[PDB]
């Protein structure tokens, strides 16, 4: 009885994290993103040998799909995910990557992945080995890591990022998605070590080490390109993302990209850019109470303007318009911008006006909290069209050409 080895997978939410994922729904999600790309059409003169660091979920997964199925690229992915086993579904990023390999093979595209700590030297060396063996060199490096912690590869110190303002304490409105209440909480300012720790985790050092180690090993093509993804947002979240501990990390990136750009533009006119993207629902969104509230408001306002979109729409445009096309959105620091429709003055004015009217009683009249909840479950493979959630599945979905570090 393989009924012993298969199970019916449902969402289990503990705190504000979904601790299960559905493999069939994750596959359908990857397919939906692939189908969006192929419907929009090919992207000309894109890279053909692409390394994506953080390739299993969210924006990194969208970049891998865009590169592969939009630009026709062979892709090498790096991520840190949990395989499935009997009675214990793996992470959504694992099932997403299983689906990616499946569809890439169907279309005759190279797909290899490395599972391990991208902050470590050992994973960087395994990645170099794969490029040498399979691709020779890569002509694009996407940096799309998001982690709350980083083990420094030389010293072994474990750094933890902090989500805090700098200077004064601040009162931040948020939405508790477990109790479904509007709630304010006071965040204390970050200590200097909380700033230093957040810069170490979320700044540009590891990104630079990736370029540094790859160069020393000679696996970056001429005219090579690299970009790191980030969020800047506007006033509502600025206490954190502009002036806060995370802001300090983003000030690291605007400097590191200049050094990286200098190294590549001497290498046959390569280029490097910080790419700024719009706010989306991500796995960790519900645990930062301000984001569910902001997203629920932003979604409703942008839907009323016809401009709501998620990861694959964002990154397809970034590739088509900025990384590979001739209508880039450069800003004054030299950042590629894909977030301009979120930062529409009228959108922001409307969100900021609704921000100060939303209460426990009008949440569903003033916001798209419904949409937030649906898109959050979607991340883990739940609520997808055409999926029979009553059918048993084997949680141990395997991945060919998966290098375990
Ligand atoms: N979620 C959002 O609203 C926005 C996010 N971004 C940027 O997008 C990038 C990706 O983050 P998200 O898509 O937000 O969510 P995400 O959590 O979906 O992606 C995180 C990725 O990093 C990988 N990862 C984490 N720790 C790792 C480790 N130690 N070793 C190897 N891989 C590891 C995960 O496997 C996954 O592939 C980040 O650079 C973030 O700043 C930019 C704009 C908005």
From Swiss-Prot:
GO terms for biological process: fatty acid biosynthetic process. The keyword NAD applies. InterPro entries: Eno_Rdtase_FAD-bd_dom, Enoyl-CoA_Rdtase_cat_dom, FabV-like_NADH_b, Trans-2-enoyl-CoA_reductase. Inhibited by 2-pyridone derivatives such as PT172 and PT173. It comes from the Bacteria. Keywords: Fatty acid biosynthesis, Fatty acid metabolism, Lipid biosynthesis, Lipid metabolism, NAD, Oxidoreductase. One of its GO terms (molecular function) is trans-2-enoyl-CoA reductase (NADH) activity. The active site is at residue 241. Pathway: Lipid metabolism; fatty acid biosynthesis. The keyword Cell membrane does not apply. Its EC number is 1.3.1.9. Coiled coil: none annotated. Belongs to the TER reductase family. NCBIfam families: EnoyACPredFabV, PRK13656.1. Monomer. This is Enoyl-[acyl-carrier-protein] reductase [NADH]. It comes from Yersinia pestis.
